[PDB]
Amino acid sequence: AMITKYLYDENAYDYHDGGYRPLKKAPGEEHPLNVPAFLKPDRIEGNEIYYTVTAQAGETKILPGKPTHTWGYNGSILGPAIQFETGKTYHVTLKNELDEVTTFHWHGLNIVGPYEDGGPHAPVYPHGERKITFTVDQPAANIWLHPHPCPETARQVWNGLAAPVIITDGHEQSLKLPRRWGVNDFPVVLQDRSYHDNQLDYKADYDVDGTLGDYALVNGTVNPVVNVTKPIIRLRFLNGSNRREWRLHFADYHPFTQIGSDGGLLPEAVEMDRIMLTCAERADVLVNFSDYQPGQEVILQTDDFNLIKFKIGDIKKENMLLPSPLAEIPALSVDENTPVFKTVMSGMDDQVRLDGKLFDMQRIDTRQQVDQTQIWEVSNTNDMEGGMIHPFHIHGCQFQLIDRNGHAVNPNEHGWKDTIGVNPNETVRIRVKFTKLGIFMYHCHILEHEDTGMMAQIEIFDPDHPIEYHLM
Ligand SMILES: [Cu+2]
Ligand SMILES: [Cu+2]
Ligand SMILES: [Cu+2]
Ligand SMILES: [Cu+2]
């Protein structure tokens, strides 16, 4: 059965809000979609790989006329693609070339916190640096890098800091997926921005309930085009927006196949003709353009807005056959004695709260034991009328969903997730086993809600290896 509906509650979508800004056509001729080159290692020594990542200011040609003053990693905007391999050890030098404190958060990476995790306790000062070391121990996945300085996160992402990060492993490699980067394999970082004389002005456009931008910005480009040379194409979608939801479908509702979620390959491929992504959610999809003619143009839309133009070249038709099962996901074993943690998202605008509280850097809100599976019950108490879908995210883990309001979970939610849209009046039940010690954040990933303080801290502890944390 092909999925032919968006898998969140229509009553709560972003376009119902009184302050909603619809997308409008960005000026300029259409450009090829920007595909960032992979970051080259500084040094490769067996299982040890060395990287340098620098947050820096630059100028990006986005709109006709004056370039836009932007922030990027190793460049003017966004960042390079960063490859991690499961089992390998990474030595990363994190450099801040900006005039303000920043932070380097690997969203979706299983890593120790709060320092290596790169949350608000891991500042990198202007013209200073921080070194981290970590071994990757999680399956192949589409994750990302972005700043996490409390409470400047929304503005720093707005200014352009985000990088697509790809974990690869032997199993994913064995599938022989489309993997020519920028030919038949594309990162699709979806963002939205407003410009004033071609310049960013976050303060001018700021909205407490989540800042929307007038123009669709895909991988830091406006009016993007993909030239389809090979008919089977991989699109790694990331909702990199401050608040906006993306309701993705081709203008003719051409079907596509989701093969992956936040934390990796799904157990089974899922066919669909549309998909909705809340903030920080990823969807790895395959599209077969074989049934189009070598002159046609196929437009990917969000709602009724033209987002990416696919121009069909001299393609040779090809069958797309995936294995069943697609990947094995080890079930987290749960019983009646599994501890249950209840966390409640409430309010909107300036009145957002997590369990009735605003974030405090020195306050640990919950304590859970390492390597012991936990049930979380995640609630959104917003009214179904006037309410809001809050994308709930946990650091330092991937989790599995049990149920949505005691009913079956969405057909693309049977794998690893680190971010879930919680509908108004919904309780989502999830199970998670934290494998890394440290302090980790959990919060709404609407970045203005996060910055207001819709965020809390969890200590993952070992009762036979205790740690004293010194939080400022
Ligand atoms: Cu994030
Ligand atoms: Cu995160
Ligand atoms: Cu929120
Ligand atoms: Cu976070």
Distance 88 CA to ligand 1 centre (A): 23
Tell me how crowded residue 440 is: count the other CB atoms within 10 A of its CB.
23
CA distance 401 to 375: 9
What is each CA distance from 405 to 201, 216, 342, 381, 429, in whole angstroms?
40, 33, 14, 13, 8
Please report where in the chains the tokens 């090979």 appear, as a residue: 230
3-state secondary structure of 397: coil
Distance 424 CA to ligand 3 centre (A): 11
Q: Pairing between strand 374-380 and 455-461? A: unpaired
Distance 119 CA to ligand 4 centre (A): 7
Ligand located closest to 378 CA = 3
- DSSP string over 220-253: TBSSEEEEESSSEEEEEEEE--SS--EEEEETT-
What is each CA distance from 259 to 235, 268, 286, 328, in whole angstroms?
10, 7, 7, 13
Ligand located closest to 241 CA = 1
Distance 18 CA to ligand 4 centre (A): 27
355: left (phi over 0), alpha (psi -120 to 50) or beta: left
CA distance 106 to 84: 11
- DSSP string over 264-304: EEEEEEEEES-EEE-TT-EEEEEEE-TTS-TT-EEEEEETT
Ligand located closest to 263 CA = 2
Distance 107 CA to ligand 2 centre (A): 4
Tell me how crowded residue 245 is: count the other CB atoms within 10 A of its CB.
24
What is each CA distance from 101 to 95, 155, 157, 445, in whole angstroms?
11, 12, 13, 21
What are the two backbone dihedrals, phi and then psi, of residue 451, each rounded to the nearest 5 degrees? -65, -35
CB 371 within 8 A of CB 397: no
What is each CA distance from 403 to 328, 376, 378, 414, 420, in whole angstroms?
20, 11, 11, 10, 12
Residue partners of 238: CB distance under 8 A and separation at least 6 = 142, 144, 164, 187, 188, 189, 190, 277, 280, 281, 282
Distance 346 CA to ligand 3 centre (A): 8
What are the two backbone dihedrals, phi and then psi, of residue 377, each rounded to the nearest 5 degrees? -110, 110
CA distance 152 to 164: 21
Residue partners of 196: CB distance under 8 A and separation at least 6 = 204
Reading the block at residue 29, the tokens are 């001729």
Ligand located closest to 146 CA = 1
Ligand located closest to 279 CA = 1
Strand ranges across the sheet with 400-404: 353-354, 340-346, 374-380, 426-432, 400-404
CB 329 within 8 A of CB 414: yes
Element (H, E) at 81: none
3-state secondary structure of 157: helix
Distance 445 CA to ligand 1 centre (A): 7
DSSP at 372: S
Reading the block at residue 164, the tokens are 């697509």
Ligand located closest to 151 CA = 4
Distance 443 CA to ligand 4 centre (A): 6
Reading the block at residue 438, the tokens are 């440290």
Distance 352 CA to ligand 3 centre (A): 7
Q: Pairing between strand 224-228 and 31-32? A: parallel
CA distance 44 to 47: 8
Beta strands (DSSP E) in 80-239 are 82-85, 89-96, 105-107, 129-135, 141-146, 163-168, 185-193, 215-218, 224-228, 232-239
Distance 364 CA to ligand 3 centre (A): 20
CA distance 5 to 2: 9
- Closest to 220 (Cα-Cα) out of 264, 187, 243: 187
Ligand located closest to 444 CA = 3
173: left (phi over 0), alpha (psi -120 to 50) or beta: alpha
- Entry resolution in angstroms? 2.0
CA distance 457 to 326: 35
Determine the distance from the C-alpha atom of residue 49 to the mean position of all C-alpha atoms in its chain, rounded to a whole number. 24
453: left (phi over 0), alpha (psi -120 to 50) or beta: left
CB 189 within 8 A of CB 219: yes
Ligand located closest to 421 CA = 3
Q: Give me the amino acid identity at 181.
A: W
CATH of domain 10-13+177-312: 2.60.40.420
Residue partners of 8: CB distance under 8 A and separation at least 6 = 245, 276, 278, 389, 421, 423
Distance 197 CA to ligand 2 centre (A): 33
Reading the block at residue 165, the tokens are 């990060």
Nearest 10 degrees: Cα torsion 235, 285, 138, 408 = 150
Ligand located closest to 418 CA = 2
- Closest to 424 (Cα-Cα) out of 306, 310, 345: 345
CA distance 381 to 395: 22
CB 246 within 8 A of CB 283: no
Distance 120 CA to ligand 1 centre (A): 12
Ligand located closest to 210 CA = 3
Distance 312 CA to ligand 2 centre (A): 37
CA distance 282 to 417: 9
CA distance 72 to 93: 16
Distance 450 CA to ligand 4 centre (A): 8
Distance 117 CA to ligand 4 centre (A): 9
Distance 123 CA to ligand 1 centre (A): 16
Ligand located closest to 442 CA = 4
CA distance 87 to 378: 32
Tell me how crowded residue 65 is: count the other CB atoms within 10 A of its CB.
9
CB 132 within 8 A of CB 425: no
3-state secondary structure of 339: coil
Q: For residues 13-36, b (16+ Cβ closer than 10 Å) or e, as one string?
A: bbeebeeebebeebeeeeeebbbb
Strand-pairing partners, residue 132, are 92
Distance 380 CA to ligand 3 centre (A): 9
CB 290 within 8 A of CB 231: yes
Query: Helix, strand, coil proportions of the chain in percent (round to 5)?
Result: 5, 40, 50
Q: Which residues sit with Cβ closer than 5 angstroms to ligand 2, an ion?
A: 107, 395
DSSP at 466: -
CB 359 within 8 A of CB 150: yes
Distance 319 CA to ligand 1 centre (A): 36
Distance 109 CA to ligand 2 centre (A): 8
Nearest 10 degrees: Cα torsion 197, 200, 202, 205 = 40
Distance 456 CA to ligand 4 centre (A): 10
Ligand located closest to 345 CA = 3
Determine the distance from the C-alpha atom of residue 65 to the mean position of all C-alpha atoms in its chain, rounded to a whole number. 31
Determine the distance from the C-alpha atom of residue 317 to the mean position of all C-alpha atoms in its chain, rounded to a whole number. 32
92: left (phi over 0), alpha (psi -120 to 50) or beta: beta
Ligand located closest to 243 CA = 3
Strand-pairing partners, residue 193, are 215
CA distance 372 to 178: 37
Distance 21 CA to ligand 3 centre (A): 18
CATH topology of domain 14-175: Immunoglobulin-like (2.60.40)
Distance 19 CA to ligand 4 centre (A): 25
